[PDB]
Scaffold this active site. Structure first.
Site, PDB file in Angstrom:
ATOM      1  N   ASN A 135       5.961   1.508 -22.500  1.00  0.00           N
ATOM      2  CA  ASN A 135       6.040   0.776 -21.254  1.00  0.00           C
ATOM      3  C   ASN A 135       4.844   0.991 -20.463  1.00  0.00           C
ATOM      4  O   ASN A 135       4.297   1.988 -19.954  1.00  0.00           O
ATOM      5  CB  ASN A 135       7.219   1.214 -20.463  1.00  0.00           C
ATOM      6  CG  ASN A 135       7.407   0.855 -19.195  1.00  0.00           C
ATOM      7  OD1 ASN A 135       6.847  -0.480 -18.695  1.00  0.00           O
ATOM      8  ND2 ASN A 135       8.160   1.421 -18.240  1.00  0.00           N
ATOM      9  N   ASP A 175      14.588   6.234 -27.327  1.00  0.00           N
ATOM     10  CA  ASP A 175      14.816   6.399 -25.859  1.00  0.00           C
ATOM     11  C   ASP A 175      15.629   7.460 -25.664  1.00  0.00           C
ATOM     12  O   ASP A 175      16.228   7.992 -26.484  1.00  0.00           O
ATOM     13  CB  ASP A 175      15.628   4.983 -25.293  1.00  0.00           C
ATOM     14  CG  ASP A 175      15.604   4.975 -23.790  1.00  0.00           C
ATOM     15  OD1 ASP A 175      14.719   5.522 -23.074  1.00  0.00           O
ATOM     16  OD2 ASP A 175      16.466   4.618 -23.319  1.00  0.00           O
TER      17      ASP A 175
END
Lengths: 225, 226
Positions: A51, A16
């Site tokens: 995602n 991330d």
């Protein structure tokens, strides 16, 4: 047992921080470093690009990017004796992507020193409920007595049950959440959080995390798992 | 702005009552749920002492729960607990059930894996009775069998004692929790450090966002408060 050896057998990474990156491949040197050092399993979660709760146009682009990346990685995984594996829901994926995942798994299975698992349409809750569904299907067939279901039985149906439990989970980018990733499998994992953004993550900091894991094993012991 | 957790969980690890000021701060700040786990297979004499201590502590806490309008709940395996402790747990839950400002849950003989496999057992028992088709089992159905499913998901999980593990506590319920680790040993944990942890939580929610369930909870609470 060993006084000197404290290498984690199964490392997981939540990648991330690219969303915050203002200005070459980061994952490849990490993967190569893991197999060269003897890590048995590396399981990764692309926090942004997996995602898929986005406009359908973006999901289509992300799937095409995933397909091209898998294709590009296969010969590299063969070169380094890494088996490619995927976890997550396949029931709603395009047929070409499912076939490509199967193809990649089949091309890299032989002669494998490490398993690299990519989480695709994966969630820890999905994984657990999928395991519960499989257990119940076995009960329906008379293969399991429902009254005997316990932790040890259930563990056989969760993803990655044939690999060691996750020893170390790294999350880059600054947030301190495991975000619905490997909930069962990381129940006793040491958690290493860093504000380093994924594009800036280095093999040197990965080695630091391994040393931190070793120190925490010395300080707090190995767990029940 | 300032972001308060709806549900705080604490792994009390240590390698005067510490929990009471924490409970009172949760009630004063509007936290809806606080769930605690005393982290640590011992001689039977030690297990008996721990059980007696738990029973005496439940007894001591019931009047405080009444004073602060807190409902007491217990999670974990009850099948191997002494019958007197089970009866005391049932009595405490019933005596405090009408309290509606906050739920304090004590995890006793609890593990997150146990919780999940217990949910799976209940679902499979229903399948065995012909009440559910196994093909219907998914996240939404399964979630109703996991402990604390009628409370908000855990927003903040604190672990004291120095280790950076969740150690098989609330795995399902803390899937999106912010995780706060401190070297402070539990007996030395103060309400001042709890205030600091809540402040850290607020800053992290500002920087990394609220969860999806948090956003929907806030929509619902705004709709209801009116």
């Amino acid at each position: 047992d060993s006084e000197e050896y404290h290498l984690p057998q199964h490392v997981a990474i939540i990648m991330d921080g690219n969303n915050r990156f203002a200005k070459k491949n980061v994952l490849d040197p990490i993967v190569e470093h893991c197999v060269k050092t003897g890590v048995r399993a590396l399981t990764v979660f692309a926090f942004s690009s997996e995602n898929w709760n986005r406009p359908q146009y973006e999901v289509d682009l992300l799937m095409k990017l995933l397909e091209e990346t898998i294709h590009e990685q296969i010969p590299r995984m063969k070169k380094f004796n890494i088996a490619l594996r995927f976890i997550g829901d396949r029931s709603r994926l395009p047929s070409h992507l499912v076939a490509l995942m199967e193809d990649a798994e089949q091309q890299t299975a032989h002669h494998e020193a490490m398993t690299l698992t990519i989480a695709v349409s994966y969630g820890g809750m999905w994984d657990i409920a999928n395991a519960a569904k499989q257990v119940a299907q076995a009960v329906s067939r008379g293969e399991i007595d429902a009254d005997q279901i316990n932790v040890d039985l259930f563990a056989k149906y969760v993803s990655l049950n044939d690999l060691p439990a996750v020893d170390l989970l790294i999350r880059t980018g600054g947030d301190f959440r495991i975000s619905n990733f490997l909930l069962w499998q990381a129940a006793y994992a040491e958690l290493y959080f860093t504000d380093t953004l994924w594009p800036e993550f280095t093999v040197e900091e990965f080695d630091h995390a391994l040393n931190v894991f070793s120190g925490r094993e010395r300080r707090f012991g190995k767990t029940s798992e």
